Motif scaffolding. Structure first.
Motif: not given
Length: 388
Positions: A154-158
């Motif tokens: 999730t953090a990567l995509l954000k």
């Protein structure tokens, strides 16, 4: 908003002979989006066997083989073919290592992200597609993984979205497994960062299941073990249950088939099924370029040319109208029809497109242009979807 058709082209895995560049024989007028496959990820996973990925100075960046660089440089000639085409680089794939390590922290994610931005600007890409197979689960130990994978993804995509901005495309592929939206991928948290999500609604021919990409369950060829009962419709409903809007999902369509595992390995219910291929059946498929001790995959153009059009006429065509897909049979030594493989043909493609329209999905995705037969399945898919 008309529908999407996102074609994979696996240029990075193409070892086929035959003159001309392999990108140059793609009809990209049939698709709206092209996922060029694959960038890999520099990684220090100890089981990694691509030494070029082990460069310590480039850890967590994206690796482009020289073949993939030569293809990406010819994007402008693709845009001439279809001025509306969107071109993405797909990173990852089956067995691709390094995502868990690249996702572990903000800093490692930033190395990854800087590499993505650079590749996107260097080749004028429309965006990037991440194919992590799979976070948390790790493809049953085939790639490194950890519980923190879900929130790290999730953090990567954000943070990828923040870098590339609001016009570039960020997309991902997600697994068939019911577990995937439950605990591998945080479906509701990632959705606003993503243009759309491609569902891998295929590769179901494992364990005790016969069909590789049935749209619904088949009662003639039922799956025994509960953990193995899968169908495209069941996968789409799982991801809707977890919270994805239909219009954000592309239904994956496989331009290929698989010998089911149940024909060559006993099927375990964590033996519940026993193999019905004898040495003869294994040798048969070996003689056609299909080493079943290695893989069960058969490209559609190989299914047509070598199985259906087999000069020896050993294969018989069948259709399952509950699963909504074709399958082939070969004859046993004692003369019964053995379930050899299920696949997709123009009929079953046209039907999955109809399902896309009536379920209200975002469109289709397919794997992949190289397995198609003179772009036939891609053309069928574009027609049935109404793409112009």
């Amino acid at each position: 908003n008309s529908l999407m058709s996102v074609g994979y082209f696996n240029g990075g895995g193409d070892v086929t002979a035959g003159p001309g560049g392999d990108i140059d024989k793609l009809d990209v007028r049939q698709i709206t989006h092209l996922n060029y496959s694959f960038g890999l990820v520099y990684n220090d996973e100890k089981d990694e066997t691509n030494a070029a990925l082990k460069d310590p100075s480039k850890l967590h960046q994206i690796w482009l083989s020289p073949k993939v660089q030569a293809d990406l440089q010819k994007i402008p000639s693709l845009r001439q073919q279809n001025p509306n085409l969107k071109v993405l680089l797909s990173v990852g794939g089956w067995g691709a290592r390094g995502f868990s390590g690249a996702a572990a922290t903000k800093e490692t994610r930033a190395v990854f992200i800087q590499s993505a931005q650079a590749i996107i600007e260097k080749y004028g890409l429309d965006g990037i597609d991440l194919d992590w197979e799979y976070p948390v689960n790790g493809a049953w130990g085939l790639v490194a993984s950890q519980p923190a994978d879900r929130d790290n993804f999730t953090a990567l995509l954000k943070e990828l979205r923040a870098a590339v901005g609001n016009k570039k495309l960020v997309t991902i592929a997600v697994g068939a497994n019911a577990e995937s939206p439950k605990s591998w991928v945080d479906v509701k948290a990632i959705a606003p960062s993503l243009d759309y999500i491609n569902l891998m609604t295929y590769d179901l021919a494992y364990g005790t299941q016969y069909f590789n990409s049935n749209l619904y369950d088949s009662t003639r060829w039922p799956t025994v073990a509960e953990a193995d009962k899968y169908s495209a419709d069941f996968i789409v409903n799982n991801y809707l249950a977890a919270g994805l809007k239909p219009s954000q999902m592309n239904l994956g369509i496989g331009f290929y088939g698989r010998i089911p595992k149940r024909a060559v390995e006993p099927g375990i219910d964590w033996p519940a099924t026993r193999p019905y291929f004898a040495a003869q059946q294994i040798e048969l498929f070996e003689s056609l370029g299909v080493d079943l001790t290695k893989d069960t995959y058969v490209k559609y153009n190989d299914i047509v040319a070598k199985l259906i059009n087999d000069p020896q006429k050993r294969f018989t065509q069948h259709w399952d109208d509950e699963g909504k897909v074709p399958w082939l049979s070969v004859q046993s030594a004692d003369g019964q029809a053995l379930f050899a493989l299920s696949y997709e043909n123009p009929r079953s493609v046209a039907i999955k497109a109809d399902y896309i329209k009536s379920k209200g999905l975002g469109g289709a995705m397919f794997w992949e242009y190289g397995a198609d037969d003179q772009n036939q399945l891609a053309k069928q898919l574009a027609e049935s979807l109404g793409i112009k």
